[PDB]
Amino acid sequence: ALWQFRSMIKCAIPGSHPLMDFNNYGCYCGLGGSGTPVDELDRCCETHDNCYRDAKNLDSCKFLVDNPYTESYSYSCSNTEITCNSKNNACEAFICNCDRNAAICFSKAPYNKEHKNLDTKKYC
Amino acid sequence: ALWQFRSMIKCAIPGSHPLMDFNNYGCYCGLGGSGTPVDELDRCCETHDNCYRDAKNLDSCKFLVDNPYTESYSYSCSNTEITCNSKNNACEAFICNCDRNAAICFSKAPYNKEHKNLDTKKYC
Ligand SMILES: CCCCCCCCCCCCCCCCOC[C@H](COCC(F)(F)F)OP(=O)(O)OC
Ligand SMILES: [Ca+2]
Ligand SMILES: [Ca+2]
């Protein structure tokens, strides 16, 4: 679920303000995303977006009947480390995995302040 | 901006995990929204959605081509009381007031556990 994805961003990036930081960044961090991603951080978001589309297509997720952000999973934070709990059923695990990789992705890419809050209609 | 709405809610509602309880609630607390709101709280979300639609059609917001969640404004919190700064220019003032109106509304509307994470495809 969305709140769990934010939780993971805070786990991976302890002092982060995930909504402040990564909503409205680039062409892809935010609802939707078109165009060429502007950088590594943006490409993380595009990957997340792709992953969710792939979850919606997943046979295991066939009873998912809204947005993967509405699907809860079980996860744990351990000293900066995220673990998708092994108990998760298949759809929950796949979506927890989407989020966890994006979280780790966020923590490794450079943050470029100028890429934040783009006029996506002119540049994406 | 959406991160500000998140802190507005934490202001009016001390307990609060905004993404956790208010997101994916009823037919209108979450993305889009169609259908008949399922309770007063759900109407708080419907009303905010409409405020945002208003915000995009408001002449003072004409240079805001994105979505109002990406518009930053200036606000304050004291004693669970929300302040939209006098120094907001008109769009920002409007959007801040949509967000303040909603957070207050959330704070007085009953939260009905059984309306959380509704099958919107089925029920909205
Ligand atoms: C202000 C707090 C909102 C939660 C309480 C209010 C209740 C109503 C909320 C209505 C729905 C608004 C939330 C919709 C946000 C959509 O989510 C889009 C998502 C936001 O990113 C969140 C993250 F922190 F993970 F970066 O962009 P995405 O590309 O998927 O990920 C980067
Ligand atoms: Ca996106
Ligand atoms: Ca909505």
UniProtKB/Swiss-Prot annotation, chains A, B:
Its cofactor is Ca(2+). It comes from the Eukaryota. A lipid is attached at residue 56 (N6-palmitoyl lysine). Ca(2+) binds at residues 28, 30, 32, 49. One of its GO terms (cellular component) is cell surface. Acylation causes dimerization. The keyword Amino-acid biosynthesis does not apply. The keyword DNA repair does not apply. Binds 1 Ca(2+) ion per subunit. The active site is at residues 48, 99. It catalyses: a 1,2-diacyl-sn-glycero-3-phosphocholine + H2O = a 1-acyl-sn-glycero-3-phosphocholine + a fatty acid + H(+); 1,2-ditetradecanoyl-sn-glycero-3-phosphocholine + H2O = 2-tetradecanoyl-sn-glycero-3-phosphocholine + tetradecanoate + H(+); 1,2-dihexadecanoyl-sn-glycero-3-phosphocholine + H2O = 1-hexadecanoyl-sn-glycero-3-phosphocholine + hexadecanoate + H(+); 1-hexadecanoyl-2-(9Z-octadecenoyl)-sn-glycero-3-phosphocholine + H2O = 1-hexadecanoyl-sn-glycero-3-phosphocholine + (9Z)-octadecenoate + H(+). Regulated by bile acid salts. Up-regulated by cholate and down-regulated by taurochenodeoxycholate. Its main location: secreted. It is found in: Secreted. One of its GO terms (molecular function) is phospholipase A2 activity. Keywords: Autocatalytic cleavage, Calcium, Disulfide bond, Hydrolase, Lipid metabolism, Lipoprotein, Metal-binding, Palmitate, Phospholipid metabolism, Pyrrolidone carboxylic acid, Secreted, Signal, Zymogen. GO terms for biological process: cellular response to insulin stimulus; fatty acid biosynthetic process; intracellular signal transduction; leukotriene biosynthetic process; lipid catabolic process; neutrophil chemotaxis; neutrophil mediated immunity; phosphatidylcholine metabolic process. Disulfide bonds join 11-77, 27-124, 29-45, 44-105, 51-98, 61-91, 84-96. Its EC number is 3.1.1.4. Secretory calcium-dependent phospholipase A2 that primarily targets dietary phospholipids in the intestinal tract. Hydrolyzes the ester bond of the fatty acyl group attached at sn-2 position of phospholipids (phospholipase A2 activity) with preference for phosphatidylethanolamines and phosphatidylglycerols over phosphatidylcholines. May play a role in the biosynthesis of N-acyl ethanolamines that regulate energy metabolism and inflammation in the intestinal tract. Belongs to the phospholipase A2 family. Loss of activity upon alkylation of His-48 with p-bromo phenacyl bromide; Ca(2+) and Ba(2+) protect against inactivation. Monomer or homodimer. This is Phospholipase A2, major isoenzyme. The gene is PLA2G1B. The chain holds residues 23 to 146 of 146 of the full protein.
